[PDB]
Amino acid sequence: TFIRHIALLGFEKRFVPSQHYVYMFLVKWQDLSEKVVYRRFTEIYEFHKTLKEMFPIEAGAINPENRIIPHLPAPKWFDGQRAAENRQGTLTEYCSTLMSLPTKISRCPHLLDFFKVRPD
Amino acid sequence: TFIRHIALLGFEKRFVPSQHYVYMFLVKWQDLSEKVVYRRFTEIYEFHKTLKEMFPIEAGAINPENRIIPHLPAPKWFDGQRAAENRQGTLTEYCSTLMSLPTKISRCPHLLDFFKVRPD
Amino acid sequence: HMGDTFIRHIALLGFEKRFVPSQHYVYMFLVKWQDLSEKVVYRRFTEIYEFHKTLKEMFPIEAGAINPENRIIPHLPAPKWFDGQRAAENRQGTLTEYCSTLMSLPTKISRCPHLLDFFKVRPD
């Protein structure tokens, strides 16, 4: 099983434990099956850091010119107003580049596992 | 006759036949003339379905790994107060991918026709 | 080789409303340098468009002004195409694509001093 496509659908406000935002991703799997999953920016950023660590060549850690993994701004750079809308635009681009990568990365178990529906 | 570039400019309320949103495309033709056209999301989605059926190979209908036509979430996936915004980001991606495809598809009459200025 | 100083990536972060000297919107870009350092810069759309026009003048071949089919410099809509109450928001998708395409151009262009200068931090 693998993912064919990820579309960023939007965000929603949540309030427990306190006010934050969750980004909604429409995940289409190999069998045309379709699921919406909900992730915080910080969780996505931790996912991205690990992805870079797993793929140093494609991360640009050896020759920076061979980098193909997309850039993702750290949380700190989304300061005040419009943080949700700002991060939404950034993630839409991040997701399309991510899914355009060679299958070595775009189907790695780290990615598949991040975007699988979480337990109730 | 053909399209060099399409840019998504935003969205606006139309009132005919009643209240809805329309997405604005700045269309640049071969002679560098630029025209804005106005299309509702449903109309774009119908364009996208038809394009797929016209191009089974490139749509991934014969062999899924050979697909190059971009993915577009169904209308049902967009609701809530930010539906119009949420579709905006999705359409920016779809279009750029759309005009990067070979001229068999990026210049097919079905596409040209779609982005031509409609009759008054 | 374009010297010891250049940009690896530019990301559009978003926009902010400014009130001085009067009501306008600036766009915030996160600029990553050769040493992987990152700075935020603030630029109004009119400034971006002038930068764009100058870029095209400097590189006629790559701007498709000789041969339209050889164009690699990205397209950018003129300021008059953005108006109404979502003008600020509406320019984002355009600017996001502009930035990524820019940074994928051959170094002769993507690290030309004009571009490098436009995205450097301005004096206080």
Curated annotation (Swiss-Prot), chains A, B:
Residues 1-120 form the PX domain. Component of the phagocyte NADPH oxidase complex composed of an obligatory core heterodimer formed by the membrane proteins CYBA and CYBB and the cytosolic regulatory subunits NCF1/p47-phox, NCF2/p67-phox, NCF4/p40-phox and the small GTPase RAC1 or RAC2. Part of a cytosolic complex composed at least by NCF1, NCF2 and NCF4. Interacts (via C-terminus) with NCF2 (via the C-terminal SH3 domain). Interacts with NCF4. Interacts with CYBB. Interacts (via the second SH3 domain) with CYBA; interaction is phosphorylation-dependent. Interacts with NOXA1. Interacts with ADAM15. Interacts with TRAF4. This is Neutrophil cytosol factor 1. The PX domain mediates interaction with phosphatidylinositol 3,4-bisphosphate and other anionic phospholipids. In the autoinhibited, unphosphorylated state an intramolecular interaction with the C-terminal SH3 domain precludes phospholipid binding and interaction with CYBA. Phosphorylation disrupts the autoinhibited state. Phosphorylated by PRKCD; phosphorylation induces activation of NCF1, leading to assembly and activation of the NADPH oxidase complex. Detected in peripheral blood monocytes and neutrophils (at protein level). It is found in: Cytoplasm, Cytosol; Membrane. Subunit of the phagocyte NADPH oxidase complex that mediates the transfer of electrons from cytosolic NADPH to O2 to produce the superoxide anion (O2(-)). In the activated complex, electrons are first transferred from NADPH to flavin adenine dinucleotide (FAD) and subsequently transferred via two heme molecules to molecular oxygen, producing superoxide through an outer-sphere reaction. It is linked to Granulomatous disease, chronic, autosomal recessive, 1: A form of chronic granulomatous disease, a primary immunodeficiency characterized by severe recurrent bacterial and fungal infections, along with manifestations of chronic granulomatous inflammation. It results from an impaired ability of phagocytes to mount a burst of reactive oxygen species in response to pathogens.
From Swiss-Prot, chain C:
Detected in peripheral blood monocytes and neutrophils (at protein level). One of its GO terms (cellular component) is phagolysosome. It is found in: Cytoplasm, Cytosol; Membrane. Residues 5-124 form the PX domain. Subunit of the phagocyte NADPH oxidase complex that mediates the transfer of electrons from cytosolic NADPH to O2 to produce the superoxide anion (O2(-)). In the activated complex, electrons are first transferred from NADPH to flavin adenine dinucleotide (FAD) and subsequently transferred via two heme molecules to molecular oxygen, producing superoxide through an outer-sphere reaction. It is linked to Granulomatous disease, chronic, autosomal recessive, 1: A form of chronic granulomatous disease, a primary immunodeficiency characterized by severe recurrent bacterial and fungal infections, along with manifestations of chronic granulomatous inflammation. It results from an impaired ability of phagocytes to mount a burst of reactive oxygen species in response to pathogens. Component of the phagocyte NADPH oxidase complex composed of an obligatory core heterodimer formed by the membrane proteins CYBA and CYBB and the cytosolic regulatory subunits NCF1/p47-phox, NCF2/p67-phox, NCF4/p40-phox and the small GTPase RAC1 or RAC2. Part of a cytosolic complex composed at least by NCF1, NCF2 and NCF4. Interacts (via C-terminus) with NCF2 (via the C-terminal SH3 domain). Interacts with NCF4. Interacts with CYBB. Interacts (via the second SH3 domain) with CYBA; interaction is phosphorylation-dependent. Interacts with NOXA1. Interacts with ADAM15. Interacts with TRAF4. This is Neutrophil cytosol factor 1. The lineage of its organism: Eukaryota, Metazoa, Chordata, Craniata, Vertebrata. The chain holds residues 1 to 123 of 390 of the full protein.
